């Protein structure tokens, strides 16, 4: 509630520069002492994107280096793994992380191929019969199914512990017309988006937390994770007006740094906040007015 008279201030004003300008300047410090060790340059996909020590995800392994960080919403109770698109080098690391940290969903935002230039490995099978092995880790993946949307694509895969025989359904929510350093075509095609994981179960308490990335992990997953995390704090206490949107932005970025990286996919968290509060507070059909509006089929 009070989100919507400051969105409509901020807009009056045009400071949303300012305000996004403000969280950078207040935003939490902390060292990333293991993420510039010299044998982990080539686990990075950026110079200027790494994991703070405090929050970093650890691999079982005895170099336990993958840039990843664990956000961990105490009050809203629901924690999210952001990373980085895996490298040709880190997808048995990434898999290896999913195993251990018991992911049920991966969130991936982005495209393998962006502005001509490889922005994340191609770290699944888009076959079914040429399944993937990560013999570093011990890991095999298949292709299951997958149902392929307008904008995005929902991929059914089996995880193999090979060192157990274990599997597990892992469900892929790959978002496909979401650049990088702009916000979503449209509140409706996004909270579309989000709420598909929701319902998928992927984000259960009963899980491991869900893995969230795009090419550096902090931008589009960034915005993500703060609609996604807003929403939850305003369904828990059913009261939309408690939630302070810059707050809970700078409580995220305690646990990683860069988190939503333009002015613009402030603005838009605010609206898609805003939208889907309607759907929190029991406004059902909204949720079938946004798959209308996305034009999913
Ligand atoms: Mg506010
Ligand atoms: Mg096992
Ligand atoms: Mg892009
Ligand atoms: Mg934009």
């Not at 996004?20 to 010299?38: G, M, N, T, W």
């Not at 195993?99 to 969130?107: D, F, T």
């Not at 092995?133 to 149902?147: A, C, G, P, Y």
């Not at 409580?251 to 988190?259: A, I, N, T």
Request: glycine share 4%.
């Amino acid at each position: 509630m009070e989100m919507e008279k400051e969105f409509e201030q901020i807009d009056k004003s045009g400071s949303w520069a300012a305000i996004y300008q403000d969280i950078r300047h207040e935003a939490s410090d902390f060292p990333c002492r293991v993420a510039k060790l010299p044998k982990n340059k080539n686990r990075n996909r950026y110079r200027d994107v790494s994991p703070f020590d405090h929050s970093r995800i650890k691999l079982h392994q005895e170099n336990d280096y993958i840039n990843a960080s664990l956000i961990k919403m105490e009050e809203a109770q629901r924690s999210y793994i952001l990373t980085q698109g895996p490298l040709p080098n880190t997808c048995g690391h990434f898999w290896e992380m999913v195993w251990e940290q018991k992911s049920r969903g991966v969130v991936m935002l982005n495209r393998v191929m962006e502005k001509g230039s490889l922005k994340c490995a191609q770290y699944w099978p888009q076959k079914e019969e040429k399944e993937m092995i990560f013999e570093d880790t011990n890991l095999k993946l298949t292709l299951i199914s997958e149902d392929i949307k307008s904008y995005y694509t929902v991929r059914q895969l089996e995880l193999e512990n090979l060192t157990t025989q274990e599997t597990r359904e892992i469900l892929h929510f790959h978002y496909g017309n979401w650049p990088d350093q702009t916000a979503p075509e449209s509140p409706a095609s996004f909270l579309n988006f989000l709420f598909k994981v929701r319902e998928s179960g992927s984000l259960s308490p009963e899980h491991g937390p869900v893995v969230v990335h795009c090419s550096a992990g902090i931008g589009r997953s960034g915005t993500f994770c703060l609609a996604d995390t807003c929403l939850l704090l305003m369904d828990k206490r059913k009261d939309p007006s408690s939630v302070d949107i810059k707050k809970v932005l700078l409580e995220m970025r305690k646990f990683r740094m860069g988190l939503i990286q333009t002015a613009d996919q402030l603005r838009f968290s605010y609206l898609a906040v805003i939208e889907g509060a309607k759907f929190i507070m029991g406004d059902s059909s909204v949720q079938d007015q946004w798959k209308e509006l996305s034009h999913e089929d």
